Amino acid sequence: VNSFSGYLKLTDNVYIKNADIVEEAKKVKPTVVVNAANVYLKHGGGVAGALNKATNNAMQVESDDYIATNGPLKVGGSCVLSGHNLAKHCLHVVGPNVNKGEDIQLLKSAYENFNQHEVLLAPLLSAGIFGADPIHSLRVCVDTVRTNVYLAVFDKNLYDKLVSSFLE
Ligand SMILES: CC(C)[C@H](Nc1ncnc2[nH]c(-c3cnn(CC(N)=O)c3)cc12)c1ccc2c(c1)S(=O)(=O)CCC2
């Protein structure tokens, strides 16, 4: 149904909210939920682990079957799989993990995958344990995504920092 509520409008197509992406998916029922995935689709922690746990491991089992037939993704790449109880579809997107020596330029490639879907609920790619500067990740999102993107950022301190930096 895509009923998003409580979002701050940053640009004509980019919205942001201090929220847990799992709680937003349950409330919104979006057509597309974005997962901050790794190349083998192993959802062992962070945003991916939270989404997987909310599908009671159904997402991991489907992900394993996809990798068996198609092999791993590339950094900056994506795949569309079932959204299970959270969404119609899950778009698994691999942003670079600069904490593992991956190239930050690939974050543009990662956000470009959003352009194939008219409206998506997403996290801030490559932020948290992936090591990218969150302010930079929001700027790449604003400059690269043209479709309607609702960003859920589960940290009030980071949310206010991103909003102040964007309004500067
Ligand atoms: C910047 C950070 C605040 C943000 N976190 C999140 N942003 C939005 N929705 C979230 N839900 C949870 C969560 C964590 N636990 N639970 C309960 C559960 N049952 O697991 C829900 C965390 C989360 C963030 C954004 C991007 C990435 C990561 C973290 S990561 O996982 O460290 C590496 C991949 C890229």
From Swiss-Prot:
Residue ranges of the Macro domain? 1-168
Catalysed reactions, semicolon-separated: Thiol-dependent hydrolysis of ester, thioester, amide, peptide and isopeptide bonds formed by the C-terminal Gly of ubiquitin (a 76-residue protein attached to proteins as an intracellular targeting signal)
What does changing residue 31 to A do?
A: In strain: Mu/B.1.621
From the Swiss-Prot or TrEMBL record, state where the protein is found: Host endoplasmic reticulum membrane
As for membrane topology, the entry says: Multi-pass membrane protein
Q: What is the effect of changing residue 164 to L?
A: In strain: Gamma/P.1
Describe how its activity is regulated: Inhibited in vitro by GRL-0617.
Q: How does it assemble?
A: May form homohexamers. Interacts with N protein.
Q: What does the UniProt record say this protein does?
A: Responsible for the cleavages located at the N-terminus of the replicase polyprotein. Participates together with nsp4 in the assembly of virally-induced cytoplasmic double-membrane vesicles necessary for viral replication. Antagonizes innate immune induction of type I interferon by blocking the phosphorylation, dimerization and subsequent nuclear translocation of host IRF3. Also prevents host NF-kappa-B signaling. In addition, PL-PRO possesses a deubiquitinating/deISGylating activity and processes both 'Lys-48'- and 'Lys-63'-linked polyubiquitin chains from cellular substrates.
Q: What is this protein called?
A: Papain-like protease nsp3
Originating organism:
Severe acute respiratory syndrome coronavirus 2 (2019-nCoV)
Supply the gene name: rep
Q: What fragment of the whole protein does this chain represent?
A: 1025 to 1192 of 7096
